[PDB]
Amino acid sequence: KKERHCRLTSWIVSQIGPEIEEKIRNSSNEIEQIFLYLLLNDVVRASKLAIESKNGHLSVLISYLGSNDPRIRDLAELQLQKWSTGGCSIDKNISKIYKLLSGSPFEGLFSLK
Amino acid sequence: HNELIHDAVLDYYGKRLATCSSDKTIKIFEVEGETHKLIDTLTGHEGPVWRVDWAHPKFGTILASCSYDGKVLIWKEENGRWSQIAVHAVHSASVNSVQWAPHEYGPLLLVASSDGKVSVVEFKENGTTSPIIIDAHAIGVNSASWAPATSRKFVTGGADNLVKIWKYNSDAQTYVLESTLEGHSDWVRDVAWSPTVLLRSYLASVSQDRTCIIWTQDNEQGPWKKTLLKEEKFPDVLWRASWSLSGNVLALSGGDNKVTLWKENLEGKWEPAG
Amino acid sequence: YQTERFTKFSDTLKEFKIEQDPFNIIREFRSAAGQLALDLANSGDESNVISSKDWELEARFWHLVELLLVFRNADLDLDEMELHPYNSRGLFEKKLMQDNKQLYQIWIVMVWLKENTYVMERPKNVPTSKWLNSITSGGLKSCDLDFPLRENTNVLDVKDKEEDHIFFKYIYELILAGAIDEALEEAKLSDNISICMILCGIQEYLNPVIDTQIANEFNTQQGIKKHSLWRRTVYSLSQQAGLDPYERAIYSYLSGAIPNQEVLQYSDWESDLHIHLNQILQTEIENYLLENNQVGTDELILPLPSHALTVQEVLNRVASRHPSESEHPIRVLMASVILDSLPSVIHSSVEMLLDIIDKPYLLRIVTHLAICLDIINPGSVEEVDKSKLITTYISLLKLQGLYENIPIYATFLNESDCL
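^ inputs. structure came back:
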């Protein structure tokens, strides 16, 4: 199952590759780029850009993407509800990334749909 | 032809002099009383070399020079042949002062440029540079002198007429400013910390407004004490201000073609000597 | 009464020689010293706080001794682990700790170090929620930890920083004490979810299904696959300033690094030594993993040092960094035990009877230790050294007027004849 999954996801990344690379070409915001790197299933370059753009905590958080740690899942979702109940303002792409950590990015209440 | 050298430095043992002029060249001499035999010329700057400065011989033969081209150039003699081993130009304007630390600190350098910055360049294990910079003064920095100590510190003279005293902090990893001092009406040309490990510490701050304030701090606590060396403006703008090691004599290089000398007396006030 | 002490130790020896396992002796020695540590400590002349600490120290020594000699001596050799390349890093880490006893010893010692680490009391009046002050002032355009890093720290309210300081310091003390569960609880409950998440990266990846040989300890995969990455990510985060010094300190510890000066300046012999053994350990694991191609090249984002110190050298450095503490006579024994150069030091302090007489605990401790050693490892301490030690301690039992319990100590020579 893991093998099959890895090949499928490497392939999908082969397909979406140029689309996203175009999008990264045109972004004017670093956190958005970090998100797009997550769109290419490149956890490491997201982590690196985070680091570089001085977004370090996020960077650490990013390193969890692809371990399915349910603790992290429910924590990320929790953070999202707390924001989506008051939370005067949260950056549009940080919330997207948290939603990825939630494990249910459309299935959701901060939805990437 | 050498109508205008801007700086000269002597080595620890005083056998090898290094003058630097406006034609960009840095000439090295083997001094011997009357006869300083020219041994070298060093061309690697894109503007007048403002200052030169040997390092402690503990680090071989190193000489960091700073010039108008905004670049600090580290040089080194190698088997009797000079070679620019490093460079440090993270300053967007003319670099004015460059002075090494006490050799107990490592091989630290102190750069001070007109972009209101002052850096402390470490030279790591690969000999490569490790710059940790700070903003020092608004309209530019004319000079920056090191302090000896046994809690490191230095002084900086500004273009906003300030005189700042910075100190290292492990919490910050960058030198944290601890005290600023105001007393001049024009660009603070030069500032000097005195090497006297005596009851108090002395600072001679020469300036463009033809004054030389002396900041004498009682000790580690009680702040400085303003003392206009003499209370009449010097016939012309003052440039340099240097302490003596043995004695605490002060040498003042005014733009009036002699160098004056001032010694502290038992009044606490300062008196000419020469 | 307290001038009972020797009895307690003597008492333990009685019980041992009489139920004719010897590790209990030491365990009791520990408890004995600890009990005494309490006595001198509670209500006392401020001349007692000193000898109270010398008893607490005594106790820690007996504990360290128990731990190490138990592992070294109760060594009855188990079954080797057979990994495959498909196996997770988690298993390789485990294998490493099984096979390399030199290094596991480092673990044992770190465990002991943590055991005896001080932690502040849980911060009271902690606020409802994170960065509440900044949010309320308006000006947090994003509520994520990295926002004031993206642009000037001037964003965060002073009080918020002050509280982040309280938090990160508390978390740090808990981490140095081994209290990882409590740290995660605090993170969760204090609305520091993202920091919590950071603390979760501590585990190497295991999958009970693949890594069969731990399908007992686990029912579910756990830990994080791209750990070399995680580790560089954390370390880099640790080097980024504009973070609280304790937060940076935390990430330093997690990356197998040495925390910043502002925090490290307050660490003592134990704390500092701990920090550096942690470094040895971290480096050694990551090297073990590289030698087995279980690290992927993509993850080597950044340079971390690859050269592990030896426990010998760490001790020498930490020593020179804490000379006063280093030189304390039971902490010398602590080190002596750590390096195993222990009979070595026994025979040594023996010749210092030929400024050991000036401090009272010492002559006792060395004697009882020597006894324990030759009980557990017959041959351990030179016959002569036992003779000399007991001789001198006995003459103090006489100077204290406790002749009553001298026969017990006699049970180790034919020289006893002469009493």
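The helical segments of chain A are 2-26, 30-39, 43-52, 56-62, 70-83, 92-102. Chains A and B do not touch (no CB pair under 8 Å).
thumbs up if we can close this ticket
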